[model samples]
Structure formats: C-alpha cells, structure tokens
Target: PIATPYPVKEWLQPKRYKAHLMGTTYVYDFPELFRQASSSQWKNFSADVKLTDDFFISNELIEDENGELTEVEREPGANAIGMVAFKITVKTPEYPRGRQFVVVANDITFKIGSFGPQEDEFFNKVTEYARKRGIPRIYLAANSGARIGMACIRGSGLIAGATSRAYHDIFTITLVTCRSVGIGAYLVRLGQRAIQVEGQPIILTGAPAINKMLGREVYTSNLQLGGTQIMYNNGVSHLTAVDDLAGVEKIVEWMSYVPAKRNMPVPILETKDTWDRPVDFTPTNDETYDVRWMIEGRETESGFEYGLFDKGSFFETLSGWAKGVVVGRARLGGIPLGVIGVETRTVENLIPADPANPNSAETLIQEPGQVWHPNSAFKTAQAINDFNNGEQLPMMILANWRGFSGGQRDMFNEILKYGSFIVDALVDYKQPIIIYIPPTGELRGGSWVVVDPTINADQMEMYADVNARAGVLERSSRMVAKGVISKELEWTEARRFFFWRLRRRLNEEYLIKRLSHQVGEASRLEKIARIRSWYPASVDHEDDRQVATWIEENYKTLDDKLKGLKLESFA
Candidate 1:
C-alpha cells in the first residue's frame, strides 16, 4: 500500500538533531518598538541583540548596485529577535534622574514565542542584572511557555529560580497578553502585582491533554478553564485590562505610587484638595448609603470634589473577589495609607439553595443580607496582613457591618477561626489604625469584640458618628432591665458639640505626644522620691491581713444598697 509509507517504525523514531527551518512567523520588532519608545518612558533605548545571535539572524532582500534588489543573508540578527534585552533610561517627575529598570517581552512570532534554552539564559541574565542594580523588573509575557522539543530540559529550573529571585529582591510586575501555559503560569502569578489582558488566558495545563487523560469530552474551550473572570473571581490575579495598551498604561501608573527601593518612602504629589473639609453626610436611621462615597468622594457629571483623602487617589485591589469587603490604597493629606470598608447592601444567594422536585409545589430558597461570612473575613484579614508586611502604611477601617451570618450552619462552623485571624492582624499591626463608625453603622456581638478599641489600645483609635449606636454594652443592659430598648445618648446640640470638641482636642494631643520626646526627659528621681515619701517601703503580714479582711467585710454594703433600688426607677 504505497510502499507501506516507508516503514512506520522508522518514521516514528525521534530525531537527535533537527535542522533549522526557514519560514515566516510572528516576532516582536525591536526597530518598530524603539521608534515608538518616544511615547513612553523607554525613550533613548538601546538593545543588546548579540546575547542570542544565532537563533535570531535571518536572510532578507536588499537593494544592490545598479538599482536591482537581491536576496542577502544578514548577520548579528534581524530587527525582530525572539528575545531582546534593552538598556533604557526613564526620566519623569516621579523618578527624576531617569531611573533604570529591566523590560523583558516575549516575541510571539519566533517559533510561536516559546522559551528555548537561549531565551531562558537571556532572561536569567537580565533578571540578575535588575536584582544587582536594585531596580524594578517588568515582564511583558505573551508566549506558549517552554519549547517542547530537544531543548526543553535546558530551560527547566532556570525560569523557576530566576522568578524566585525576582520575587524576593525587587518589585516585579507581570502583564499577560496572550496564552501563557505550563511554566508561563508560574511567571504570571509570581508578580507582586499581576495584571491580565481581558480575553487572554493563563493556564498551567493544556486542555487537550486533560481531555485525553479523562477519556471523555469534559472541556471544550481554553477560556472556560482560565478566563479573566474565572481567575480574577478566584483571586488568582489582582487586576484585569481591556487591551495590551491599557495594561502597559496601568503598569506605569502603579509604579508612580511606589518607590524604587523597598526602604524608601512612598512618593507624594501636590494636590489642591483640602484635608480639613468636612465629610458630606447626614445622620439618617433608615436609609442605606454606599461607603465608597466616603472613601472616593462624590463624582458628578459636571465636576467632583475630594474625599477624606486626595481626589482620585484610591486604587482598590482584589476587587473581583470578596464582594462584601473593600480594600485599597489611598492618600490622606498627601500621605499614602490603606483603607478597608464593609459593604452594607443585601447580597443575594450567598448560601446555596436546597434542591426540590418538579412535582412538589414548595421549594427551598436561601435569603441573603449584609453579614460577614468566612470567606469575606479571611480575605479581609489577608489584605490587612499584606498591607502590614509591605509598605506598612497607616490603615483606616469603616465599620458598617451587621454581624456574622447566623442563619447558615456552614457560616458559624468556620467563622470563629477566620474572625480570630482578623483580630490577630489588627492586634499585631504596627502602624496607626483608625476605626470610624458611619452614621448608619452598627457593631454588635462578636464583631464588636474582634475590633474592640482595647484590642490594640496603643496604635488603635475608634470613633462614632452622631447617629451611630454600638451593641457592646447594650446587649448586657437589655438582659437586666425590662422594657428598656437601648441606652439613650446625649442628643442635645450643646452636648454633641462638647464631645466633638473634646475628641478633636484628644486627637491633637495624641499627635503632639507621638511627635514629642519631652516625656522621657522628665526627672525620674523626683518622681521616685515623691512616691517613697508618700508610701511605706513594705507592709507587715498582720496589716495586710487586716486590710484584706476589712475590704471583704465592707464590700457587701455596696451590693446590698444596689439591691434595694428598683431597676425600672432609672427609666
């Protein structure tokens, strides 16, 4: 049958060395990129194309003598190399002196932009250079992961080590454009901040292999497995973009808020917003308002004003996941800070519904409301821990939650463990933390205990609006007194104004105490001498016993007096 196709056994044998094939393919054009560098901070860029010269060089047509074009072989490399290293200077108002950073991009045209041995070596070299220089490393990846041929083993372990080093040393940002599979997944997820392009997918395994292994038709499309919504909703990525250009623009914008080195202070900018402007809120008992208005301020069709911080300075992270909690970076009076807010809207179907038969008229459906669950609590704790570890920015918490979800059994089973983590994070935090209760906010039950002002009394502070009420002592008061709803507040204008003025004075005094060291300079000897003259050095055992006996005998008088009065008389 057609000479048996030249023996199938011989055709199936793997080749030791394959010849390089010449064909047209897609690759990143260095010349075109250098031309367009003027639009970005990468202007005046120069390339070191000799690092992987053999794999990049190709033949091209040229104009020869007598005005006739001829085919000629070019050495060194073509303008579009598979892996190109560049040295560039970026000078901007944020980083004046032209900060130097490394940019590594995967050229998709070269062998489908798979990483070969030479590409891996070049990547390692550039990352090492960045680490040694203590600068940021930006990776623009659009590849199919490591090549699967004879050179695959040579690239192994190199990428993993290089990425690990980058993660530990400098600020690394990854932008994924096209399909990133196998080893590419590691590179994309290892960034301190990972941003993905809207339709692109990043997968650890290919779908065809998975389908073959399962021996049935399980998956149909790659996007279904590793799409933007799937990854972002699961907390695999931090941000998503509409296109490649938007991804690059976000990278530049994010770098403006951070410093080149980890030890340096965060960058600050001049703003026209006033810090002393009063918050635009009114005390209402029944209406629900968005807490974002307090953090981001009002954005109108005509114009807008700043919030408690600077205008348009809040950047939220992990926004797709944890719908009930909001965590972000913001600026307070030109100072970089962290903000965490609780969403009070009624979320639908937080818990899954029970199944019912079609014939049955009754069906089980789960109702939803504003309450903390295990996932939201854990995510909030994780965000706070990340903020404390990195940058250690001062934090502010907007307390507007009801309490933990009590209707669902699964909610209570794990809420305590997760709630404890939040307490641990807040108690261990070293930076200043301010917790403010909004007009309609109420802290009740375990929620109040977890975020109590006494948890971390030194660095933590709590405040409440005029209409806000707490349930910490109210619940206990309800048990002892009949027909009493809750404690009454001093609702008069004079009383409210007095407390507000006293709060302002205490805040100012705390700031002064924090900034001043005069307390340590006070005379310790004078204080010790005064205390020595006022009290005895040691008391005799008989005297101590007599004093203890007298207190024990007289303590019941106060309890007896309290028992005579009717609890309803106070009302």
Candidate 2:
C-alpha cells in the first residue's frame, strides 16, 4: 500500500495563523522564482525590477449550493485556480520608491491558471486598488483558463464555466507566457498593453474545446489560433517577442515609462531633454495627442494642469474605463481641486436614458458613450463634499460635449436618465467652478449650466478661446441650407444668436442674478478680499515666492478661515 500523510503545513498553518486557504489548492508554488527575480538576480538585468509585495496566499473562498466546492474537492469550496491578480506593497531599493503594483501571475503547480469567481473578485479588487492609488499594474499571465470543476453547481445541474464579466475596468500590462486558453485569452486581449512570449498559445476556448463543439476532428496540435503572429496582426497583442525571461524584462522596462496615476502628473528628475520643451498643443491639434502622455507632462512641461471631477464616495471610479476622460484629484497652485475633462478620442456607444426601467439604470451604470461616467462623477463629488463640504475643493471643468446620444438603439436603451443624473450632479454642486469654452461644449444647452458654474457668470468664471463656438443650436447651417440665411455668416454671429436665444428661453439674467446672490453669501469672499487688499499694498510685486509665502503665513487655512465671511448683494 502506498503510504500517505496529510500535509502538515496546511493543517498546522491554518490553526497557527487563524487563516484558512479556502479556494486554492497547492500545485507547484513558485515562491522562490519571484523571490530570486526581485532580489539577488534582479540587478543583473537592464530593467528595474520594483516588486511592491511578495506573493502571499489569500485565505478566502467562494461557495455555492450542495456544499461541494468546484476547485477544491473537499466539502463545498472552489479553489482560486489559474493565473491570479496580486497586489504588492514593497519598498524598491533600485527605484527607491514606496508604491503598489498589480501583478498577473499563474501558479502552474496548482490546477494551472484558471478562472473562478473568487479569483475574479480578487483580480477586480487588485485592479480597483491600483486604480484608486494611481499605481502601476503589471500582469505576468500564464494560464490555461478555468480549472474544470471549479465553477458553481446550481439546482441539480453542474454549471462549470469561466465568466467574462471580470475584465470590466481593471487596467494592466499582461504578458502571455506558455499558453493562455479560455477566459485567460479574454484578459490578454483586454489589457492596455500586452506581450506574448515565444511558444505561448493565446486562444479563445482552447483548440481542443473548439474542435469538440464544432464536431470536427480538431486537436491542439492542428490548431491555428493563439499564435503570436496571428494575434499581433489582429492588433490583440501590442508587443510580441521570443523567450519567457526576455518578455518579463520587456514588461519591467515598459512600466518605467507608465505613470503611477492616470490623471495627475508624476514627479521625475529634470533631464536636459526636457529643458525649454515647448507646450506643443494647439487648438487645432490638441485632440491628436494621447491624453495620458499629456496628463503626465502638462504641468512640468507647461504651466497649466486642466481637469474635471465629481463628488462621490470614490474618487477615481472612471479611471482606465474612459481613457478619453481625465478625472482625478490634484493640487492647483497648492489648492486641492477636483478635475475632469475630455482627452482626444470621441466616446462611443452611448445608451439612451430611460426614467422607468430598473434594468436601464443597471445597464447604464458604467457603460460608456451614453454620457460621461455619471456614477464616477457622482462618487468624486460626494468624496469632495465629505472632505471639505464641497466648498473646500473648487472644481475645474473642461467642457467639449458634442451632445448626448440620439441613435435609435440609444433611445431604446433608456440612456436619458443616466445623462440626466450626471447633469443634475453638476448643477447641484455648491462649490466654486471655472469653465473654459473651446468649441464643442457650448453647443449642448444652457441646461449644461446646472453643472457649469459659469452659467451664473458672477460666482463662476468663464474663458473662451479665440476659436470658441458657443450656441444652443447649429442654426446657421440649418438656415443656410434652407435659404433663410447666408453661408457667409461668421462663427461669432452664431454665438451671439445663441446667447440671445438661450437668455430668452431660460430667463438668463434671473438665473445669473440668483447664483450671484448665492455667491455673494459664499465663504470664499473673505479670502478673495484679503488677497485683493494685500496685492497693491505689498512692496514685492515681482517676487512670486515671497507673495506665496506671505499668503500661506497670513492664511494657514485659506478656505476654512474664510468660512465666516459671506458675500452680500447691494440689493
């Protein structure tokens, strides 16, 4: 008889540490592989290896009915199998930075890299954590999708399959090593940047499974999918190369260039190449450059940092979901503010708003192209409100909306309610706001003013580019086509007509006057007055440093101290 003994460490560790290894079973632990890469052998490589956290097993599990687990055969627990997402917090000696990184790693010694709901939750949490903190996420993916028998068994029938709902807003640099089949292939394709090592098969549902379903004699040997060249040509994988270690080296190198956060600028040593670098964006071409590169470089290279934000329980919700919209928190001239704005690409696939449908609300929650990510904005706004009661942190909005969705599908999808929710959040804000009208934003409506503080024109501030086009309707084009107006009418003419039409339709002066009354009673007036009184009376007008120091010394809590002073109207 073969002699066998229960794993001593498993039994001992659980009781000793008060933690249970619930969903995962040990296959082949590669603890030493990463340990060596991050420590002794790491320096020999050209790329900087900044591993934030070491591998630690999460003693968590997911359960289903019948008390029989999917991945773990004992009792009723499903093990976390396949490639997993891990978040590590480490102090890098080479980079000398204290930060976190999201890792996509597979434990081959286990049941290969497979997808379980628990694993998906773990991955989602990792991505969400990285996004919230503005950390770099690195995925070292080598998986064969879900382990067979690892899914929940429901209602007398065994339901075992991987779920694709996990890849929602998580962002990472995925590296496909060896083979990525089933749901693993889904993640590789969805990563922001990907590199596939030689001999890796990146396929959907694996060749064997596909063959069985198609009733053909297809096998893994005769499979044509998942080749590096095939995926590369299809633009699924961004980069491809030979060798596994080399691929890892490439990821480490690429990470150095990625920003820690999507919206805010990261600090870097000033190099000679950066000196005298021109602010290269023009009104005509600002839309051409990638917004991520711009967000990272704008403040240090240029003097301005523009952004948009909302109030909420979470601050960075829309991050990575909409690469086109830059949303985050930052200090503008040392003042904490919420920022939101459009990047370059136009947002696609907006769902229409509906007031009655519960499903509509659920579907429209984070689905892009309907309107801006409304809940994200809502969460940001709420967070700002909580931190300083909305008054402490002023918000800056970069408005360039081309209007909400109007397609038949969008209308049917009830996208209007989502759009309305976002609009309401903006209008309801009680903080100071500054809006810059370029071209596209003003055409939406005077209704946009609910969020756009500048609609008040007194409490809010507005700046227009020379090429700005502001109007409620694109009437000139319509009238010209109908022979009621000449095509020679200038852009300014349209703007003037729009302004009048908007004022007439909405009783514009009344709205502005009311907002002005509110602003007059706002808490910022005292601070503004102090700054005004100090400017002309001071001796050093040329020394900006001296002025800043004087301001800080005089007003340690600028926003808080000014809370008592309310603006009064001369009514």
Candidate 3:
C-alpha cells in the first residue's frame, strides 16, 4: 500500500491541539485547515458530479506511532495537511449513446495544499492507476505549493523522474476549484487539460518572493498570474467558468468525443437516414441557425445523430476563453469528423477597445468575430488523427474560418505555432481528407492553405453560396479599415472591381464553383466505380429460402426479408 507521512488525522485536528503537538514535537505540525471544508461544498460538488456507488472509495487519517495524531498549529509555513485523491469509474447509461466519466479528487482541506514527498508518491500512484485504465485523469487541486523545500527522501531529480514516469500514460486534467500555487501549478501543467474556476488563485510563484527580488510592492492577489484569462490565453487552461459545476460539465463534454486511448475505434452504427440529403446552397437570413445543420445532414447517415451528445452538432470547446469561434468533433456520414467554424455573431463580444484613437472603433466593426484558439485547434486536430488512425475512418474538414485571432494577445500566445500545429497535422495525416469550403470564406497562404495542399483529394472542393467571398484583402480591405491604409472606397464598387480584375486574371482555371451537376457526375462515377470494382461487389443470391427461414425464426415479420434488400445477396 502506498502511504504518506502527512496523515489525515493530524491534519484534521483543532488549532489548539495542532499547536500543542507541534510545540512538544518541535516538528512543523499540520494546521487544522479541515474545518474550512464545508459539508455544503462537498454536498454540492457530489451532486454536480453525479456521484454513485460504482465509484471507488477510500479514506485515511494522519496519526503518530501511539495512534495519536500530531496536529500542527496555524502559522506561516507550518500547517497540518490532509489530502486524499479518489479514483472513480462511471457506468454508461443507455440514453446517451456515448457516456463516460472518471474523477480523482485531491482534497487540500488539511494544509494549504502543500506538496510533500508522500503527496508526490500518492499523486504518482493515482496517475499510474488512471494510465493503467486508459482514460483521462481528473485532479481536483486545492493547495499552496511544495512542502517548503522538504529534504529529499531520494534526490529531487529522481523524484521528478519517477513522477513523470508514473504520469506518462495518464492524460492529466486538473480542476482548480480553490487555490493552487507553486508545485500546485505543476499539477495543472501535468494535466493535458485544466479548468480553473473564478476566485481560485493559481500562481506559479508567490508574490512576496518576486517582489523582494524586483524591489516593488507585488502581492499575491496583485500578482494574480493564473486567473482564468491568464491561464486560458497561455494555453495551459482549457476551460474556465464562474463555478465548479460548469467546469465539470466541460470535462464531461470533452471526454464524450475523445476516446480513452489513442487509436481506439469509437462505436459507429449505420442508421435509417441516408447520406445523400438535399443540401441548400442558398444563404437564408436565419442568424440563429448554424451552417453545421445543413452540412451534417448532407454528410452523415443520420445527421441529426451527429449532435447525439450536444446541440446542433456544435459543442463549443474553450467557449468562455475563445468567444469569437467554435471548434469541436461531430459525425459526418455517421463517422467522426473534426469541425471548426466561425461564429460571426459571437466575434465582437471580446473586442478590445482602442483608447489611442476613437477612429479605431469603426475598424472593430469591420472585424468579423472570428476567434480560433491555435492551441485548442491543434489539440483537436491531433485527437482527430489519433481517433482516425485507430478506427481507420476518413476525416472531413469543413473550412469556414475567416482567419486566426489577431491582436497583441494573439501574437504573444504564439498563434503561428498553434496554427502550424493544425497545418502540420493536416500535411502528414495518413488517412483520406474531404475539404468542403462553404461560401464567402477565402483560403489563402501558409496561414490558411496549410491543409489545402494535403487535402486527400486532387483538388479541395470549394462550395459557396451565391454570396461567397474569398481573397487576401489584408492590404486592400483590412489594413485600410484598421488605419494601416487610410482610404474608404465604395464597398460594392470595390468588391466588384476586385473580383472583376481577379477573375480576368485567374480565368476559369482559378475559379472554384459550388457542386454543380457537372462536378457531381465526374466525382460520383470515379468514386463509386472505384469502390465497387476494387472492393467486393454486392451479388444477388438465389438462396431466399434460408433468409426467409432465418427471419421467421428471429422476428415476427416473415415478409420483412422480402421487403428490403435480401440478406442472402450478402452471402
């Protein structure tokens, strides 16, 4: 059994008891931080997580050799710590087609959530357990930092190596429900995904030390480095919300689309809906409805089921952090596909104001609310590759992005690197890719066309509604609007002139059309003909007697076999 020097009994004792124990023992006693944990907090948390009996449960207490707990008094750097991490497994219900939930709760109620050697070992063990089971590890962190430079049982290097090894298989995810600082930050970093709630302080280094070095008045809250905005922009935190319930929901939603391990085939079933549904190429004035509704229906067997886990086949990842755009995974033709789309409506919600010039306000209006978090986009792309490799399913990328997130924050976040991640993944994807460009979106240079060259087709098919627009108008339109170029030309005249010149130069060779009868005839013949000839052909079989007999035995409807395509043909 893995054990820790920090005991729950010692950490849970009262302040007076802890002081007495520390005073007598001369060792830093664990402070009585236990009482701060409200029963209401645990109750609410349990209800939110939907805890049930199937989950694994264990409890431990901190005690001295005589079975008496050593309680540390509440003092700077001297406090008792009672920390426990749980391992839970969720049972899938029949209603939701794909259901999975796993959690490991690390209680920081005893101490300020300081990490000791024992705590390290405990975390290592928990992570190893999660890895062994092939699922994401959920770490509920409430802590301060490492147990103030504790003496090494081994060496610091050895401890780090061991911890990393133990955590290798586990895709660590941390939920900062309370305070997380110093070593606590390491836990968050170890997690492939992190969620930090409001009011939680997640700092890598405390303020006093930094202030002392800098000769300034930096304090903990003032130096608040790991707030939702800070961490989310930095790409360490994936989700941020006002409360813990929302954080948990984000985790559940993420897990639903992602499988437990790399290269595992998620269940795919053929349904009653046909793949060839009528697609409306016309742009309607429906601001509320998403273009995904139309695409999913046309591509998937049951496009409606694509949103089996979420609404309209659109479940926004990093929704709070990246307000301008949306990216997630859904089914295309009843097969899993990665989806990235621009939400024109939500773009301006987080637009930064220009204090330098009031004229810049108009520039913001021209800016389409297109937000793409490179980190999340890369992560989604990586997951797509992983799932596709495992299942051998083709990936369909619906390119509707206006462009990358711009501004100082985006630049500092290394948007280039994030964008490159998707580009590189697309370039190297071993499977087939079908790219569909909806109207009005221009596909341009390395930034935009990184995947265009690698799209698994001869030429990436571009389908646009009548109002589709495409071009690199940075110097022409964007620069002018942003004051980089100071001139306002007639909008209609400019676009027409631009397209006229563009079309004159490019000709029919450069033009991409909506899927017309001509294009469909060519693609259908080639693709279907290849599939039929190279693969097994469905041959009609004369053995109807066996099929009829089998259907009669299995079901009440004997005529059902005759009504549909005969199964004997499959023989």
Candidate 4:
C-alpha cells in the first residue's frame, strides 16, 4: 500500500521466476541492461529521449502445461512473454520525434538469448527495417551460444550474409553486453563498429572447443579467450565500457558526432565560446607529453584554464589497442572533427598472444615516441578510412612522428605495408584535412612525405607551430625557405582558435556542395531562390571550382548598396 500504483483487492503480484524479470542474483540480466538504453538516461543526455514501447520481433512462444514450447503470435509485443529478442525506436536529443533509430536487443531470458531460426529471422527483419528507413541499427548483443540443436546454423549463412551486407549498406553497430559466441561473435564483428562491455567475452569458439581441437587443455575460460584483454587489444572492439549503461552512453555520444541519417547534414551544436582565443598547453621541445593534454587541456596551477579545442569535446576510439596513435572524434567550434593525435611517449603495447604458439605469453612492447610502428600505422590508416567513408567528417592530423620504424623487429611486422596504408587513406579522403605540426614537434623523412597535404591538395591544408620543423630529415633550412607551411604562429599560443573558425568555415563550404549534389527539393528551393537563377546541371559540385565560384560571386556583389550581402558580410 505504501507505493502501490493501483489498489489491489487482496494480492501480491504472482511471484516472479522469469529470468527477464529476475536476473542471476550476482550479475545483470538482459532486461536490466536494456533499461537505461531504452530510456536514454545513462550520462550527458540533453533531453528525456522519447522511446517507443518495446515490441518483440521474435514470434510469441509459450511453454504449455505439458511443458512443450510452441510459437503462435507474430504481431508486435505478442512475443513479450517469451523473450529472445525485441525491437524499439528511440529519439535522442537531436532527433525530435521522427529522426530515430531501431534498437534490436537480444533478451537473455529464453534459450540464453541464443540464435534459433526464429531469433535469426527476427534480427534480420529488424536490421532490414533500419536499413530501409535509413537509420542506424543498434544491436544489444548478449548471448551464450547459438541454440546448438537449431541455431541460425540451419543456415548460418543467412544471418551472417545479412549482417555483412548491412555493414556496406547502412550504419550497423553492436554492443556486446554480456557474452557472444560463434555466430554471436560474427554478428558483432560484422557490424564494423563494435562496443564490448567489460568482463564480456566475444569469442568465435570457446576455449574448451579450442582445447578439444588441439587434443589438449591449452586454455581455461572463455574470458581468457576473448575478454577486453584480448578483444580490445586486438582491435576487434573499437570502444570499451564498464557496463551496458556506459556502452549505451557511448552509442549516443558517437551518434552525436555523425549525421543522423544518410544524406542528412551532420548536427551542429551552438556554443558561446569565442571562435578565436589564446590556446593553452604547448608541447615543449623535449618532453613527451600525452597528446590528450593538448586535445583536452586542464586548468593551470594558477587557476587559469586554456584549451586548444572546445572544452570536454574529445571522445577517443580504439584507445586500448594502439597507444602510439590516438584517434577520436572531437568538436572544434561546435563542428565535428576526426582528430588523429600522435602519441609522443614511449607507448606500452602489450603484445598479443601468438595463436600459432599457445606457449607465447603477453609481452610488453615499449615502442619509442615519434616513430610509427606497425600497429600505429595500421591504426592511422583505419582512422582516416572511417573518417572518410563512414562519418563523412573532416579530419585534423597532428604530424609529430619522426618517421616509420625501420628496425628489424618492426620491418618483420610489415611496417612498410602499413605505412603505405596511410598514403592510400589520405588519397581517398572525401572531406577536408588539416595537417598541423604541433609546437616543438618534428615531422621528418617518410612521415612528412606521407602526410604532406600536397598529396590531397584540393581538400587539404598544411599549417605549423612557430617552433615546429618539417623536412625529409628534420634539419633542412632549405625546406623552410621553400615555404611549405601556411601559418607559423605557435599552435597553442597567440590567436590560435582561428584554425577552429577556419575549420568550421571550410566544412560549411563543402557541405553545401554535398547538399546540392543530392538534388533534393530543399536544396533546390533555398539555393535557387537565393541566387534567383536556374540551372539544368553541371560541374557545380566540383570542390575546388565551387570555392572560386563563391569568392567571385561574393566579390562582384560587393557594392549592391541596399541589396548587398547582409548586415554582417558586406559592410
């Protein structure tokens, strides 16, 4: 009676035994994991997200008095009582009511949330829904193993093919909440961007199975096979979280940096911070400071706070794997940017266990600063590719490396192959690139050639810190005299935020061309009306030619008097 929602005649609700309602006393159950995600209240959420009522995608299945399970209903919510998976639509802050995504969640209450044919079909249908609607598909994966008797294994290729194609066709992501095995593992991996919760195992096969195949007990636990220690370190998991709630938080935060749907403009946040300001945190000539300190500046001992970019905007990805190269999304003047900061300290890379030799142990790889090893080079390539093809966001590369490691050990690891990978990514970038040489940083030799900005001269700009040096070998005044640099101010001192303003302006320029290329009604209406002109079609979308067109269009209209540009631009 104390907290009753309604007056009950004489009843305590039927004592619950469903695993969905009451999880293992020690750990979280599936329904518990879905709560914060559906509600969107994990952390830093702007508004109370509007969540559609949960609807089961799996067919309704019930255990009768004879203790036999049978399926019947197929309508939404009909399968709620017998759970293996469900679907929901969510509206995050930027998406008011309609710009939403589909959440296909595995309910661990039935068959350990394993993939039977029914579960597989349901997941495929839900994924197709998101793809058809052109919205993100967020999968909450928590499974023990596929139902061995009749898992998606009936046609394992069915779910696998669907997932694989979804990666190319749409934005698909999976967050491993508890554990994933066999097809479960492949599902998340195929999503392309994976978030694995801490303590969760994402294994293709169990340790027991591996030992059986080896004819000996080479391993002990699934955790030993695919925990964060292995998965995060090997780069199978792009992001890691403490729990399901944190993983959901990461999903929303990541979406904030990218467009809500295909062909939609990326959301921009309004900020009060001035476009230009004196930056803080200068990298000294000798010390190897953490690159994050420059990306995320802190208050000084004297109580003065300064930051190179916007405050608290850096959200790093692939953080656990490659320490020498840092990759993440951050905001510069409320504009989303893909930041690739070079880690300058001697990074401690825990060399992963060698599969060929189970006797091999996790060893420490203390690689030196300002040198690109295989993992760092591979990491850089992956960062640029995703920024270019996936998010469609502009990028900023802090060029601080001395060069790619040419040592015997690194060459053994295919350093040259991976180093060339960086060049391939740069050549294919669709958005603008800003290559900055941080104060006291030196971009020398092959690395300078790799990210010369001249390589992608159309969509790129190269700038530098006043004390920064760049050349084939870091000691060529001849290179400095040739004027390869754009601006020579101290990057983290003086009037520095102009770069942020410049970045925003550049984004504005490219995105309009992108929008016009779409040929949408909204695009034609606004630009057509503004220009008071007509065009059938042409090279209007050329990135370089369009810029010159804008300058000429503006420069010629300089003195239209009362009909000039605007209150701000002309006079």
Cα-based TM-score, every candidate: 0.62, 0.40, 0.55, 0.76
| Model 1 regions lying over 4 Å from their true place | 1-89, 96-100, 115-134, 150-169, 281-283, 300-306, 348-370, 389-392, 406-431, 449-461, 473-571
Over 110-160, each residue of candidate 2 has an lDDT whose tens digit, in order, gives: 455555555555555555555566555566666566655724112101111
RMSD of each: 18.6, 15.1, 15.3, 8.5
lDDT of each: 0.57, 0.42, 0.44, 0.67
Query: Model 4, range 1-571, lDDT digits (tens) per residue?
Result: 3657885422232112333242221112333444455355323444533345442122333435553343444433334321233333344444445345656666565556677776776677666766776777777777766776722476456878988877755667788877888888988878868899888899988887788988887687778889998889877899998866788778867877777776465556534455467777777766657788788677678874556667777889988887889999877767777899988878877676765485887688888877999998998998897776547677888888898888899999899898889989999886778888887778987788788878876567677776777777632244456666555656755324444434444534543454454433344346434442221245253343353445445543422521332333332
Q: Which regions of candidate 2 are displaced past 4 Å?
A: 1-104, 108-112, 115-137, 149-281, 284-398, 409-436, 439-443, 446-463, 475-571
Model 3, poorest ten-residue lDDT window? 26-35
Give the per-residue lDDT of model 1 (tens digit) for 234-339. Answer: 5666788886666766676666555555545555543455444555433356776566766777776776734555567778877766667878887654556678
> In model 4, what are the clashing residue pairs, if there are any?
445-472
Which regions of candidate 3 deviate over 4 angstroms? Answer: 1-83, 94-102, 149-171, 218-223, 260-262, 267-313, 322-324, 331-337, 345-396, 401-416, 427-434, 445-448, 453-535, 539-571
Q: Which sequence of candidate numbers ranks them by TM-score, best first? A: 4, 1, 3, 2
Q: What's the C-alpha lDDT at position 555 in model 4? A: 40
* Model 4: lDDT of residue 19: 33
**Local distance difference test, candidate 3:** 0.44
Model 2: lDDT of residue 533: 53
